[PDB]
Amino acid sequence: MLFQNVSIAGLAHIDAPHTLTSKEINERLQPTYDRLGIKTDVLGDVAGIHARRLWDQDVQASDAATQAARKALIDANIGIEKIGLLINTSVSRDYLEPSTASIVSGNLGVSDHCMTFDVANACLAFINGMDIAARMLERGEIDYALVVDGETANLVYEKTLERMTSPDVTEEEFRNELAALTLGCGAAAMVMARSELVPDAPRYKGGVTRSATEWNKTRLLLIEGIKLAQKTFVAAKQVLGWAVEELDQFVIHQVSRPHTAAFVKSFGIDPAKVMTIFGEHGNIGPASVPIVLSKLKELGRLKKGDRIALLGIGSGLNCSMAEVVW
Amino acid sequence: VPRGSHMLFQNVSIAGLAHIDAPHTLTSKEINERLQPTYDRLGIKTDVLGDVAGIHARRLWDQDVQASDAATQAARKALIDANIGIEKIGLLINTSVSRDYLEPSTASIVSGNLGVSDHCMTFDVANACLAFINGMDIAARMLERGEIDYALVVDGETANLVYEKTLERMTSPDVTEEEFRNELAALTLGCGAAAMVMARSELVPDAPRYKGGVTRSATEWNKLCRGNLDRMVTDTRLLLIEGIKLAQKTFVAAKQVLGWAVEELDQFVIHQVSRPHTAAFVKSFGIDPAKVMTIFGEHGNIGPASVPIVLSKLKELGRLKKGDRIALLGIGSGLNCSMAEVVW
Known part of the structure; x- marks a missing residue:
């Protein structure tokens, strides 16, 4: 699929x-x-x-x-x-x-x-x-x-x-x-x-989405976002074969430092695998994920065969996760 | 073959x-x-x-x-x-x-x-x-x-x-x-x-089928109609002329991929900008005006909802029969033109 x-x-x-x-x-x-x-x-x-x-x-x-x-x-x-x-x-x-x-x-x-x-x-x-x-x-x-x-x-x-x-x-x-x-x-x-x-270009595998549109009506966003992401990660495990330890990079949307830390903590993700630019650039909305991926590429951080997770929690609420193999 | x-x-x-x-x-x-x-x-x-x-x-x-x-x-x-x-x-x-x-x-x-x-x-x-x-x-x-x-x-x-x-x-x-x-x-x-x-x-099993279709564009004309919440500015003259030109290209593609010939379609559901724009369109392509339902006179131009509203009104009126080939057509600001087929 x-x-x-x-x-x-x-x-x-x-x-x-x-x-x-x-x-x-x-x-x-x-x-x-x-x-x-x-x-x-x-x-x-x-x-x-x-x-x-x-x-x-x-x-x-x-x-x-x-x-x-x-x-x-x-x-x-x-x-x-x-x-x-x-x-x-x-x-x-x-x-x-x-x-x-x-x-x-x-x-x-x-x-x-x-x-x-x-x-x-x-x-x-x-x-x-x-x-x-x-x-x-x-x-x-x-x-x-x-x-x-x-x-x-x-x-x-x-x-x-x-x-x-x-x-x-x-x-x-x-x-x-x-x-x-x-x-x-x-x-x-x-x-x-x-x-x-x-040939030899990174491959896009696709991904999964889960939603919580019951919340379409910031402190609240945090907790409910992580709950949603948890659902989405469960789905990712099944369709993507994801296991946190097997991914080489997490390219994530950034709302703030506290939101990112809570996320990393919740999933037991190695923070070294999560590049952040919010400190100097703030929140660039839906451009955030591809800007970070581009910076990782230009910095030579990505190697052939790396498994890269692209993900975000967006207003909606929605959560999408996708995989690229470099 | x-x-x-x-x-x-x-x-x-x-x-x-x-x-x-x-x-x-x-x-x-x-x-x-x-x-x-x-x-x-x-x-x-x-x-x-x-x-x-x-x-x-x-x-x-x-x-x-x-x-x-x-x-x-x-x-x-x-x-x-x-x-x-x-x-x-x-x-x-x-x-x-x-x-x-x-x-x-x-x-x-x-x-x-x-x-x-x-x-x-x-x-x-x-x-x-x-x-x-x-x-x-x-x-x-x-x-x-x-x-x-x-x-x-x-x-x-x-x-x-x-x-x-x-x-x-x-x-x-x-x-x-x-x-x-x-x-x-x-x-x-x-x-x-x-x-x-x-x-x-x-x-x-018995529902209408949607086949998809074709699109052509002329994005050098993206300034012709610009709209926000409270204002729309439109060069109606150029919309007509450039729209028809774009539609002619799209129709050639429709013939190629959908196998369209106008006389073989049963209904044309056409987005409407105005009565004269629609008349020019139908005349340009030799479409039988009897196959074109319009609601523009009493409802105006409802943007991207126009086509599905007209399709829904056709269904409700009992105008659509099993087997009917229905063309969905529009020229949208961009400029874009899309043509797609539904088989009832």
Whole structure:
């Protein structure tokens, strides 16, 4: 039942150019801190986010996704004319209509045969996009697919910071405004291909999903997320043949340091097998997983035969887990 | 001579289908009364809604109805039509242009409302007016492989906000001719919802079969129609011209892979942008207008829900017979054109 002929031909990520440190955020919030007596560095000391990146002004999700896509095409050594499917998986989107994917595709110059659309599913959508493309590849509908994802948070910082520093601002809800201050900009793209076209490329096996949509209505997210992941890992054991000790890397979405630690603790996972970029980049939504995988690749951390788990707990709640064999 | 499948879907069926008509009628007559001072200032003497676009009314929800609410209503009805419980659903895809939130997915909200099981996979697909077909295709690939038994594809569209804000903008004493023309097509949209239960054919032997189909694109035209929650700007002239061109390419592909010849199809379920756009389309391809049901005159353009709403209305009217070959066709902002077949 697992995918037999689906590979990863190319992968890339883009780090956004402007740094906004939590120290800087705090300095701006200090007056509002002194009111309401906050006296605690939630971002730096609790969430463990010390910085995030922002794009230049007027960079759209499509722009960021396009930048990542160009780099992933180079990584795959293929021209855009080969791409038969382009899926955009980002939370950030240019418009409701048309798809952000169509705009990225127009920027790249895809052929008139190229099928495009957006998939949206909180921080899990890139994994969903990979599965969707894998099924088309497997059936022989296309030879190469792009899965792209650009996230923008400039506007959310501008508005939230502006809001939080107003004289009328009250606390109880304000504490929830801090959550948006864990988001970061970044982009990633992956070229997937039929395996007979790219021997020796990493193989995508597919995965499993379990949901708890009864919770679609942060402290709560943590516990219920781990409960859900436990269900999903049980499923993974059966369809993927997973055993924690047998996996070489866990590439996981990152909400915060506490959430990641609780996860590692719960599954008895070796923390050395869990790369994290949240400290410097914050939460890049559904782009997080492929950005981390790309960083692992560029750092030479991945060796032929490594078993790599891709996973996340997303708003929904949903939990998806998938395997790549490098 | 042994031949392949052309990669069309095998053993994928439509177990159930439903639509919801939104409750409140807004007539083009009332809209024109509101716009009359602006028409007069701009020298507009023709009824550009009723006579040119060909829309006489559209339906709206209440202000507090979200896309997920409308989608949920359609889904409950589709389950009844398929005579199955929500526990049988292994995939739920939401395909609407309208969206509750950036996150989580509208699909997750509908799923929570319906009470899907913990095995249910859910996500949104967005692709302007073609997304319902994309969702059917995505579900079909899983059903054909036997990964799931049943899937829901759901779509609720809410145009209340775009009507409210567009009418305000278009009645400004200062609105320009250019912006009035830019936003006019928003007054051809309508509210409504649809849902479809798809299934492995072995579970529903007598149900209609879904074959899938073909897509062609012209993404250099991605700027032609841009829409958000409260505004849609549309180059109607170029949509028509470039749309027809794209559809001609797609029809060539349809002939190749679906073996289509227009006279051999029994029904064409065509997404509608406007009466003249549809007339040009039908004329361009020599389609028999009697094989084209339209609801645009009284419901307007319901985006990606349009095709399944019209299919549901056809089923309910008793217009569809066993063996009927039904073409599902649309040109969506992108630009994209998709053509697919259902055998009743």
